[PDB]
Amino acid sequence: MEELKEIMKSHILGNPVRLGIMIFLLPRRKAPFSQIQKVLDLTPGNLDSHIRVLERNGLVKTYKVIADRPRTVVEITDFGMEEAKRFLSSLKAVIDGLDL
Amino acid sequence: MEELKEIMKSHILGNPVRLGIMIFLLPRRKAPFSQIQKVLDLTPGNLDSHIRVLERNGLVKTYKVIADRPRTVVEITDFGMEEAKRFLSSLKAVIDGLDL
């Protein structure tokens, strides 16, 4: 019951959309906002809101690359990578205990 | 990328609180509202709202047991059990592919 509550209280990383964004970035480190939006089939508006939540919590960082091809890049931070791994590991442990 | 989107679109079962409630019920089948509230450290108000979302989607069912000890019982439905397992299996597959 103690590990279940841990997962239940992860309101930031637990959200299915944010979790997917973090899993997407885990192996890639960074990607243009426009690519994430298209590949994960999200509207620019929803993606934007989730990105803000993640960045306010230091899980990702965003910056404009105006090297003359305007693009906003989303990058997972070192903290973001570790937090995601911790959360994914806790989730894996709970699932393994269920025997599916 | 196809399985990631599947998990990201599970707005009902994906929510960390609802997921925890379903994982709690998976091995127990049913429990009094009051027990779930206390063991998962949730306020009666938040639990109530999540339960309504789950019940409107046929994942759980609720009923009052007035056998002269008034209590609301929360029970996971057969559909709820299968949907949860499907979602948990998809989640497990994504995690295994990450190599943690």
What residues of A are in contact with residue B5 (Cβ under 8 Å)? Answer: 20, 40-41
Cα–Cα nearest to A15, from A58, A51, A56, A60? A51
Alpha carbons B57 and B32: distance in angstroms, whole number: 20
Q: Do residues A31 and A25 touch, judged by C-beta distance below 8 A?
A: yes
CATH of domain A1-100: 1.10.10.10
Query: What is the experimental method?
Result: X-ray
CB contact under 8 A, B8 and A100: no
Find the distance separating the first CA and the last CA of chain B, reported in whole Å.
Answer: 18
Q: Do residues A90 and A3 touch, judged by C-beta distance below 8 A?
A: yes
Please give the structure tokens belonging to residue B88: 């948990």
Alpha carbons B65 and B13: distance in angstroms, whole number: 26
What residues of A are in contact with residue B10 (Cβ under 8 Å)? Answer: 16
Cα–Cα nearest to A75, from A85, A66, A63? A63
Listed resolution, Å:
2.0
The domain limits of chain B are 1-100
- Mutation test of the interface with chain A: which of B8, B35, B42, B94, choosing the one with the most A Cβ atoms within 10 A? B8
